[PDB]
Amino acid sequence: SGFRKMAFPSGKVEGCMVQVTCGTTTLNGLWLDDVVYCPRHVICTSEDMLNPNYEDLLIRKSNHNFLVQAGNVQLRVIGHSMQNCVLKLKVDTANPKTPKYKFVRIQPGQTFSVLACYNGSPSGVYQCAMRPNFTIKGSFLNGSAGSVGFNIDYDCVSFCYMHHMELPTGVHAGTDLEGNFYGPFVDRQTAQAAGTDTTITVNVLAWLYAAVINGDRWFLNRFTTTLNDFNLVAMKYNYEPLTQDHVDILGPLSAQTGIAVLDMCASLKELLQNGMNGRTILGSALLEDEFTPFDVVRQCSG
Amino acid sequence: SGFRKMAFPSGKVEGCMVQVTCGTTTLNGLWLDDVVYCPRHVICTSEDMLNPNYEDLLIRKSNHNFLVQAGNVQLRVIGHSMQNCVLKLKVDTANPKTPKYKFVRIQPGQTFSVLACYNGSPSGVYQCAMRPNFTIKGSFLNGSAGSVGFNIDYDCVSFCYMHHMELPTGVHAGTDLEGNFYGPFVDRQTAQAAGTDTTITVNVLAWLYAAVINGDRWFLNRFTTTLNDFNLVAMKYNYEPLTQDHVDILGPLSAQTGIAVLDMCASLKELLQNGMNGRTILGSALLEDEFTPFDVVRQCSG
Ligand SMILES: CC(C)C[C@H](NC(=O)OCc1ccccc1)C(=O)N[C@H](C=O)C[C@@H]1CCNC1=O
Ligand SMILES: CC(C)C[C@H](NC(=O)OCc1ccccc1)C(=O)N[C@H](C=O)C[C@@H]1CCNC1=O
């Protein structure tokens, strides 16, 4: 028993992390087969990041402008092209540590692990969710661009995120591995703001089930509600509305605890109207929304 | 910027995890050079765990009673001995993925990463602290014994924890890698309880500094206090007393923010007397004590 913010083991990804230098700008790249993927703003100087023309900036470079280091080994760039907001650097050597992988775009509310890296060197791993406003609440310093987010599906690494930038509110924005931004953001140092965030309701319910599984039951009650009555009050507190797909997704957790989904919604509805009043749930005094139903099952059943 | 519960990258440890089977009991082992380390209760049947005599149980086994699997490969046990609460299985093959390592015993209040494993297979990584009562608030299911806790110091893995058992309160207990338990616990299925836990004060202060570094300043005030006045009120709320060593350890964070340690203690003293009143700090509505001063520096400066 117990419940922790748990990330995927990062070994398979650590072997793909490289350092990419172009000019006086160094950041991280992802080396899979004979391609290195990295954020395209590695080709910008400090002055270019204000209003860059990446097509111009790229035509003025040659393969030898790109320094790629995999630990102690230098990799020879033999070709380069731009795909949306990423750079694809073709290199002479295929990465022998290339895992089975795919590129997936995730949806708001889903979670993934982040391997934070500096100078091509893995520094830490943590778990986060893609917010409904397409930002992530990450932990990133200067030099972290090119760090990647991933899930592991059996023996297959699903890459879903490459880090690019921090917004003025201190939250983080990036792309999928095809270079398409999550959210309405661009890779230039302009003033862009995220839209308003909402709480991921299906994830809160999943976490309440994790609490029951671990012996926290004080918030339960005998009432029930309907999808429409719940959604009416959820709107008022900035909670995502709940659908029948969500209810179905919570099925396994309903079965294991014998508490129906709409039963648990009545508890949630009560917690929203009255608060926790100095009580905690799984060691927290706020409602946690960064665990999916699948995360809970994975941790509370295996 | 940002602040997350961040674990060390686990790749170097994933390569040392093996499956150890003896009888109908399977758990995890740690394979370094030509020794596999695992909890000694792998030699117990379901009936033996109530009052085991491990010296008797061990003399009745031979090397071939021990099935050791490193993925698909079987390892031949060529010798076995018991060191306190661990088993040392000598095998014919040295682990080629053996990192630079050492065995260290940590102190209450210090943090480490845990690689949770099942059947020799790494399942997840998370960060925790050794509590003042020598338990950890982990997340572990049946089959997790032999999972290890570690820190990474440059290129060197410091192993500090091997998991053995869950106590009735749902918290976890284990040994260092020499087989000596943390806390007054024994590896038999008796009724043992942890002593009362306290809050790790130096860690709370470190986290308040992380909050200031990230722009949360609402709890600051102009007062100051002395070590003795602070410690007087801290005792009443079950907080560890604060020493001059702690003050010195918080120096780098005091320097970076321009707020003296005893200045921040007055803020803490205020938060203990009055609470947060619906405000949060770094996304939490409780005071967090599982980040050391070193964790904060590592994440907020690099
Ligand atoms: C998209 C390009 C214009 C470059 C990008 N811009 C950007 O974040 O500007 C706003 C900003 C700048 C500096 C500090 C705090 C906020 C940029 O600096 N990326 C960094 C590259 O490693 C990563 C950033 C650095 C802080 N944490 C991160 O995640
Ligand atoms: C020290 C020996 C007697 C064996 C040990 N005893 C023990 O925890 O009994 C109390 C108990 C038992 C079952 C379930 C919940 C609580 C034991 O079962 N270890 C398990 C070996 O993988 C790991 C445990 C299992 C739950 N989570 C863990 O961390």
Q: Decide if B140 touches A, using CB distance below 8 A.
A: yes
Question: Is residue B106 within 8 Å of B130, Cβ to Cβ?
Answer: yes
Residue B250 sits in a domain whose CATH number is 1.10.1840.10
Residue B34 sits in a domain whose CATH number is 2.40.10.10
Q: Compare CB distances from A141 to B9, B280, B302 and report the shortest one's residue.
A: B302
Question: Is residue B193 within 8 Å of B184, Cβ to Cβ?
Answer: no
- Give the 3-state secondary structure of residue B167: coil
- CA distances in angstroms from A278 to A233, B119, B199, B239, listed in the order given: 22, 40, 17, 18
Burial of B36 (0-12, 13-18, 19+ CB in 10 A): buried
Instruction: Give the integer Cα–Cα distance in Å for A137 and B3.
Output: 8
Ligand 2, residue B27: give the atom nearest the CA.
22
Q: Decide if B299 touches A, using CB distance below 8 A.
A: yes
Question: Is residue A266 within 8 Å of A219, Cβ to Cβ?
Answer: no
Domain that residue A47 falls in: 11-91
Interface with B, mutate which of A3, A5, A151 (most B CBs under 10 A): A5
Calculate how far, in angstroms, residue B299's C-alpha sits from the geometric centre of ligand 1. Answer: 16
CA distance B142 to chain A (A): 9
Reference A150, options A100, A200, A198; nearest CA is A100
Question: Is residue A221 within 8 Å of A227, Cβ to Cβ?
Answer: no
Identify the experimental approach.
X-ray
Please, what's the largest Cα pairwise distance for chain B? 69
Instruction: Give the integer Cα–Cα distance in Å for A163 and A182.
Output: 10
Q: What resolution in angstroms, rounded to 1 decimal?
A: 2.0
B49 lines ligand 2 (CB under 6 A): yes
Pairing mode, strands B35-39 and B25-32: antiparallel
Q: Which residues of B touch A11 (CB under 8 A)?
A: 9-12, 14-15, 122
Question: Is residue B262 within 8 Å of B247, Cβ to Cβ?
Answer: yes
For residues A159-188, one letter each, b for 16 or more C-beta atoms within 10 angstroms of the residue's C-beta and e for the rest, the string is: bbbbbbbbeeebbbbbbbbebebbbebebe
Mutation pick for ligand 2 pocket among B38, B128, B142, B167 (CB with most ligand atoms within 8 Å): B142
SS3 content of chain B, % helix, strand, coil (to 5): 25, 30, 45
| In B52-196, alpha helices (H) | 54-59
Ligand 2, residue B142: give the atom nearest the CA.
25
Using the structure block, give the residue that is written with the tokens 């979670």.
Answer: A111
- Give the 3-state secondary structure of residue B90: strand
Instruction: Give the integer Cα–Cα distance in Å for B126 and B29.
Output: 19
B119 lines ligand 2 (CB under 6 A): no
B144 lines ligand 2 (CB under 6 A): yes
Q: Which residues of A touch B301 (CB under 8 A)?
A: 141
